Enzyme design. Sequence first.
Site, short mmCIF file in Angstrom:
data_model
loop_
_atom_site.label_atom_id
_atom_site.label_comp_id
_atom_site.label_asym_id
_atom_site.label_seq_id
_atom_site.Cartn_x
_atom_site.Cartn_y
_atom_site.Cartn_z
CG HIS A 137 -0.61 0.24 2.51
ND1 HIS A 137 -0.49 -0.81 3.41
CD2 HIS A 137 -0.37 1.40 3.16
CE1 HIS A 137 -0.10 -0.26 4.56
NE2 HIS A 137 -0.02 1.07 4.46
N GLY A 160 1.96 5.79 9.57
CA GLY A 160 3.40 5.83 9.32
C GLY A 160 4.13 4.61 9.87
CB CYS A 207 2.23 0.62 7.30
SG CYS A 207 0.56 1.01 7.85
C1 LIG Z 1 -3.75 4.69 9.88
C2 LIG Z 1 -2.98 3.52 10.43
C3 LIG Z 1 -2.63 3.48 11.78
C4 LIG Z 1 -2.01 2.35 12.28
N1 LIG Z 1 -1.70 1.28 11.55
C5 LIG Z 1 -2.00 1.32 10.24
C6 LIG Z 1 -2.63 2.41 9.63
N2 LIG Z 1 -2.90 2.43 8.24
C7 LIG Z 1 -3.91 1.79 7.63
O1 LIG Z 1 -4.64 0.98 8.19
C8 LIG Z 1 -4.13 2.18 6.19
C9 LIG Z 1 -3.55 1.17 5.19
C10 LIG Z 1 -3.24 1.86 3.87
C11 LIG Z 1 -4.48 -0.07 5.03
C12 LIG Z 1 -5.87 0.31 4.56
C13 LIG Z 1 -3.90 -1.16 4.15
#
Ligand SMILES: Cc1ccncc1NC(=O)C[C@H](C)C(C)C
Lengths: 304, 304
Positions: free
Chosen positions: A41, A143, A145
């Site tokens: 992503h 951030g 990820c």
């Molecule tokens: C915002 C956030 C806070 C903590 N962990 C992860 C995230 N990010 C996501 O969940 C968005 C990501 C593009 C998915 C839809 C695949």
Amino acid sequence: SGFRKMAFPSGKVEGCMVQVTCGTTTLNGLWLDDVVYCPRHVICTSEDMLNPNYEDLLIRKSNHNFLVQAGNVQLRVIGHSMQNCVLKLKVDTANPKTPKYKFVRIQPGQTFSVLACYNGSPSGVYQCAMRPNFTIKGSFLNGSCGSVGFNIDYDCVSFCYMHHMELPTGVHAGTDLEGNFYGPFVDRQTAQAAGTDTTITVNVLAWLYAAVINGDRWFLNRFTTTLNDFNLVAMKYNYEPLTQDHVDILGPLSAQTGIAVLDMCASLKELLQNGMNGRTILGSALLEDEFTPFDVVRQCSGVT
Amino acid sequence: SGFRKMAFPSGKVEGCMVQVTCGTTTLNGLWLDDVVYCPRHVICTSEDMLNPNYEDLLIRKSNHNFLVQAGNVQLRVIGHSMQNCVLKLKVDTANPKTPKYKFVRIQPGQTFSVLACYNGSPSGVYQCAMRPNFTIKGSFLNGSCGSVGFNIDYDCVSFCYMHHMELPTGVHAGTDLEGNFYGPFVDRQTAQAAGTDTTITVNVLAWLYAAVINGDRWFLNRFTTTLNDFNLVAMKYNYEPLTQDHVDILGPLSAQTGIAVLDMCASLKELLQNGMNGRTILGSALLEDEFTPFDVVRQCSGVT
Ligand SMILES: Cc1ccncc1NC(=O)C[C@H](C)C(C)C
Ligand SMILES: Cc1ccncc1NC(=O)C[C@H](C)C(C)C
């Protein structure tokens, strides 16, 4: 003595963290040998995350679009490929800090350490369990990820998890290092059902053994139970059914303390049925399920 | 989202751990620049630990008696000196992995990460608080002495603690990096009174703010209180009296959430008086006091 929610030393994993930027999105990547692994992503924009067509989005990207930085050094990307939900960016330099490592798919109920990172930089490390429903209750902000989960066997780092998503419920989801999600999750901004979770029974028992080793014994009683009887209680209290494979893994703890596994099961049964009566076990006022029997043995013996 | 008992990444500290052997005793040492710091009790035998005459015991030792090993390399000891309860072994090689570092004496109520080590090898890292009575509730076995506590400000490691002792109660005691014990403790195998402990009020409030930021809000109520009234409750429940300096430090959290500090104090008052009623706050069934307001802000913003 004393028992703590201990994480593995993060040093070997810190040496692998890089920052990956594609377009205006920045996240973390794992640089092992001449490959950088990151969540796919990184190639999406906000307008895409509702239902990204990842194959199409990746076709608009070239090697030079993935900016990989290991703090002060920029890595030259010579190849890119998508495997499941991860991108593998081939770089022209093998990471000098690459530890001996394995990519492993962990099972629900197992534990691992997470090195939370932002923009390729390590912010903290904590120990957690993979829930029976394949989510993890982490601490991740936008951030984070690409932050990874791991276990360490002396010199070998077994990478088991890469963070991808925060579900609308505030629980977390991610993949193994081949990009396969744990659980039913997809990398889309859509509400997604996490399965019914259960408490990891073998872990709670392992922790009750850690409590006895370390002085907390008030919960031991004059009773015993059977797997059948205990499993009726586990059923009522949303605990994983205990099997002979779980009893077998508790063998070293049962042997050290001299408390038969089914006798500890009867202490667990009484705590499920009566609660803690305002008391604590190893500094906790609830039944802890984030220590496997292996973690208990390792911590209680001093394994490095 | 999510809130975890996070430790600092241990990498910078792992690069400093060495093993120190004197006679038949082995423990851990901290190699910074050309000096190795370790607990002075490395020079004692079992027959000495009842009341060691450390000055006399050290006079029977020469530089060549301190065997210092950094895994595969042996360090050449060119000087030795005792400063308070630590030994400083001058080595002929400056540690190439020496991070930017400070030696700081932390205050009771502050937190730090501990890198538990055995025979110079890192086994795990966990976050903990220095109790108001100057003990720490760690996880240390025989051989863990010399393991250190620290904080990290971007690139700088502030070493605040070195482990020396396990009290008969199973609680732990140690020194700053100048060898001064935190608390009344002496490095002798004698029963030693740890002061009456209290719960770190400002930390519990900081954690209640972390809970609100992360979705756990059930404890918020329609009430407010005063420092005087709250301090009468803190008194009854063995909590640290709250001062304006504590309210001031909670300012950023109060500002972010819009919940006035005294309003959070009234939520804390109600939880002390009524308990949790079988509910949890951030996965805990008790009031957590191991997160400072600084740790809460850092974790909630993503600081690396
Ligand atoms: C915002 C956030 C806070 C903590 N962990 C992860 C995230 N990010 C996501 O969940 C968005 C990501 C593009 C998915 C839809 C695949
Ligand atoms: C046994 C142990 C387990 C965990 N932490 C520390 C220890 N060692 C001691 O307390 C003995 C030491 C020589 C002191 C008397 C100065």
